[PDB]
Amino acid sequence: TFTSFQLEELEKAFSRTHYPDVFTREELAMKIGLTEARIQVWFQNRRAKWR
Numbered sequence: 001t002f003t004s005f006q007l008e009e010l011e012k013a014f015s016r017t018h019y020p021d022v023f024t025r026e027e028l029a030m031k032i033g034l035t036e037a038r039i040q041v042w043f044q045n046r047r048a049k050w051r
Protein backbone atom coordinates (compact mmCIF):
# COMPACT_ATOMS: atom_id res chain seq x y z
CA THR A 1 0.00 0.00 0.00
CA PHE A 2 1.20 3.46 -0.87
CA THR A 3 2.35 5.73 1.85
CA SER A 4 0.65 9.14 2.24
CA PHE A 5 3.70 10.93 0.84
CA GLN A 6 3.72 8.57 -2.19
CA LEU A 7 -0.02 9.08 -2.87
CA GLU A 8 0.41 12.85 -2.44
CA GLU A 9 3.20 13.03 -5.00
CA LEU A 10 1.32 10.77 -7.41
CA GLU A 11 -1.83 12.96 -7.15
CA LYS A 12 0.18 16.15 -7.55
CA ALA A 13 1.66 14.69 -10.74
CA PHE A 14 -1.78 13.53 -11.99
CA SER A 15 -3.18 17.01 -11.34
CA ARG A 16 -0.60 18.42 -13.76
CA THR A 17 -1.29 15.84 -16.51
CA HIS A 18 -3.14 12.61 -16.74
CA TYR A 19 -0.44 11.28 -19.09
CA PRO A 20 2.96 11.79 -17.41
CA ASP A 21 5.80 10.71 -19.62
CA VAL A 22 8.47 8.20 -18.78
CA PHE A 23 11.03 10.81 -17.69
CA THR A 24 8.48 12.27 -15.24
CA ARG A 25 7.54 8.79 -14.02
CA GLU A 26 11.21 7.83 -13.49
CA GLU A 27 11.92 11.04 -11.57
CA LEU A 28 8.91 10.29 -9.37
CA ALA A 29 10.08 6.69 -8.85
CA MET A 30 13.45 7.87 -7.64
CA LYS A 31 12.02 10.55 -5.40
CA ILE A 32 9.28 8.49 -3.73
CA GLY A 33 10.90 5.08 -3.43
CA LEU A 34 8.64 3.06 -5.78
CA THR A 35 9.41 1.49 -9.12
CA GLU A 36 8.49 3.33 -12.29
CA ALA A 37 6.42 0.28 -13.24
CA ARG A 38 4.29 0.47 -10.08
CA ILE A 39 3.82 4.22 -10.69
CA GLN A 40 2.98 3.65 -14.38
CA VAL A 41 0.27 1.16 -13.46
CA TRP A 42 -1.09 3.55 -10.85
CA PHE A 43 -1.51 6.22 -13.55
CA GLN A 44 -3.15 3.69 -15.95
CA ASN A 45 -5.52 2.57 -13.18
CA ARG A 46 -6.39 6.15 -12.16
CA ARG A 47 -7.10 6.99 -15.83
CA ALA A 48 -9.43 3.99 -16.02
CA LYS A 49 -11.26 5.13 -12.86
CA TRP A 50 -11.56 8.67 -14.34
CA ARG A 51 -13.01 7.42 -17.64
Ligand SMILES: [Cl-]
Pocket residue numbers: 036037040
Ligand atom coordinates in the same frame (compact mmCIF):
# COMPACT_ATOMS: atom_id res chain seq x y z
CL1 LIG B 1 7.60 -0.96 -17.06
